[PDB]
Each structure stands twice: as structure tokens, then as C-alpha cells.
DNA sequence: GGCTACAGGACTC
DNA sequence: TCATGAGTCCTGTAGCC
């Protein structure tokens, strides 16, 4: 099999630049508004102009400043750059029926009976490449190998605005000398508690008991490494289908008064139920965050679809639950449905 | 023993 | 006054057949 994904590069950032040319060259950083005070949220993304300085997803947006006061700072247009991710993949769908799009910015495409080797797939990349920017003049990386997961990692390797193949070879030596901290769905915790097993690359977990690499990190991950470390991965491109839809925002200040919070839960019900747009979901959980950042929750599934207000006043119990519950201060308030009709 | 629902953990974008 | 927001898969625990 031969599989080829497709990853934009710095998006929401390249997005804005192609909607106003005189941002390309300066440090872009898309920001994640919460309100509670000035400047308060996160960034989105940086375009690597400001990547090379440090700002990047996830620092507060004071942080961010405070390295480059100067940036052209942006907020988050989401739904402009879905309607533009939504225009790329219709035309990534005419290089294979076998596609999967992963996220806002990441497909999967299974070439193996379009092309007949690497060589041809590596072509049919700059192909990909060039007609991306033709027609939407975005620049994406494209990765190559034989499964998803060194597809990837082929990727994550040549970008921004590059291609790689990884061949059998090639697959073969990263298993042995990657480290194993690059690999998909390794996070820092998953690495650490890999690093203190003396475990650093893919072949490691071949030698260490399956028993003890279970009991550390799971038996799901531990079998996902050793299937990787054999060179024995098989994961197929499907057609991924949106399990759940929520909406979760941040309070103006900290609370834990049923009434003060409420306005806020409902805000994030309306939003949840436009995006449901005709989906109709079995289950609903209130999902809050308290003053210590911590994430705390409580559901239920019913064997009907939930109306618009069955869905205001069960989140009202739900949330009661959270308070009744745990006496911490609630940070964000929200809601997220699935289970769908 | 193992399926199921629920809540928390980890990861990725 | 650091700390967004969205969505997915896995696991521990407890009920139940
Ligand atoms: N932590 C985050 N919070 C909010 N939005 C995020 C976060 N991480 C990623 N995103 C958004 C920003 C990106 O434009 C988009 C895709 O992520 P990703 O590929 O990892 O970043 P990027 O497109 O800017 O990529 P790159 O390093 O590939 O050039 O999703
Ligand atoms: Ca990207
Ligand atoms: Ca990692
Ligand atoms: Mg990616």
C-alpha cells in the first residue's frame, strides 16, 4: 500500500496571508480571544516567521507579545478557514476515492491504484502540490510511505511547503534510529514514562517484556508501538464520520453559583445545537473546567434523540451534579453531544 | 470473563 | 493577570449476564 497525506502549512496563519497579501514576510499569530480580560486566551498558530522566536500554539497570548510586541496579532476566523479547508479537499477527492480527511488541514490518500511505485507517487505529490497552489495558492507538505502513521511522520519531517518519501529502506532505519518521542501519539507523558524504561526508539519495545510496556503505558499504545517496531502496521483510510459536537466557553470570572454560571451553559447549548445542524444526538455531557485548571464532567445517554430543551434543563442537573460534586471554582463552562440518530 | 456506560487521561489539530 | 477551543480514542470501575 502507498499512501500519500497532505498537510497545510502554518494554516490559519497562511490563510490570512492569502486574504491580505501585505502580511506575507512579517510575524503573523492567530489568536484565541477568551474575554476575561485584555489580551487574555491563547495562540491558535503562528506563521514561522514568529515560529522561529518562540510564539506558537498554545502560549498565552501576553507571553507572546512579550516576545514579539510588534507581530501582527489576528483574531481566530475558524469558519473562514473551514470553508477554505472545505475547497482544498474537494480537490484533493480528484487524486483518489480512497481518502480520509483527518483534520482542518490533514487528509490521507490511498494511491496505491492510482500510481505504481514511489517514484510515481512522489510525482503525483508535486502534482497534488502545484494544483493546491494553482488553484487556492496555499502551500501544504506532502508525506509518502507505505502506512499512515510514516506518512506522516514523512511529513512532519519535510515541512513547511515540502514532500518526502519514505521508502521500505527508510522504514527500516527509522525504526531504529527515530526517536520514538517524533512518533504519532506519543505525547510528553507517554514519553517520559518510555524514556524511564530506557526505551527511545521503535525497536526498544521489541526487546523489553510486553507485559511491563503494558502495565506503563496501556495495552492499546503498547501493541501500536510493537506493530510499528515490527514493521506489521495496517491502519486502512476511511471516511471519518464526526462523533460529537460541542461548544465550551470561559467565564468572565470563576464560579460555582448555579445562576451566575448558567447564562453561560446556555450560550454554549444554542451554539452546539446550530453546529448539530440537523444531527440529533442520544447524549449530553456538561464539561467544566475549574479554577485549577482541571477537567471535570458528567453525562447521560437517552434512548431518544434530545430536543433543543430537554437539552437546557438536563445540562441544568448535569452541572448541579459537577457542583454537588466537587467544591472547586468552575474556570470554563460547556457542553458536548454525540451518540447521533 | 467480558460487555456496557460513565468519567477521567492523553493526544492531536 | 498564563492557562483557547474542538474532537477522538483508550482505560478503570462497577453492574450485569
Ligand atoms: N493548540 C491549538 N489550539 C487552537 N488551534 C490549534 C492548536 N493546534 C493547532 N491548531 C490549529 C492551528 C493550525 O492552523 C491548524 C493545524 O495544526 P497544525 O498542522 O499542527 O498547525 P499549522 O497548520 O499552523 O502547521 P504546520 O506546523 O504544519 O505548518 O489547527
Ligand atoms: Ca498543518
Ligand atoms: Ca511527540
Ligand atoms: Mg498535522
Known sequence: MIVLFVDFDYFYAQV???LNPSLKGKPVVVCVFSGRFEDSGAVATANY???????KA???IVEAKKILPNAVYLPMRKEVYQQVSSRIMNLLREYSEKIEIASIDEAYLDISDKVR????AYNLGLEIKNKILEKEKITVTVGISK???????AA??????????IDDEEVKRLIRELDIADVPGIGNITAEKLKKLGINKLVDTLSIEFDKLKGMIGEAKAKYLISLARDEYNEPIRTRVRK?????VTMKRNSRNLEEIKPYLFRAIEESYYKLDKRIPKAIHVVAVTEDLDIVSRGRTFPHGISKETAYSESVKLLQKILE????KIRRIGVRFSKFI
Request: glycine share 10%; no cysteine.
Open 16 to 18: 490570512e496571508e492569502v
Open 49 to 55: 516567521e514568529a515560529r522561529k522566536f518562540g510564539v
Open 58 to 60: 498554545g502560549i498565552p
Open 117 to 120: 511505485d514511489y517514484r510515481e
Open 147 to 153: 502506512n499512515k502513521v510514516f506518512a506522516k511522520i
Open 156 to 165: 512532519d519531517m519535510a515541512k513547511p511547503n515540502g514532500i518526502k518519501v
Open 244 to 248: 460529537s459536537i460541542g461548544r465550551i
Open 325 to 328: 460534586e466537587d467544591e472547586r
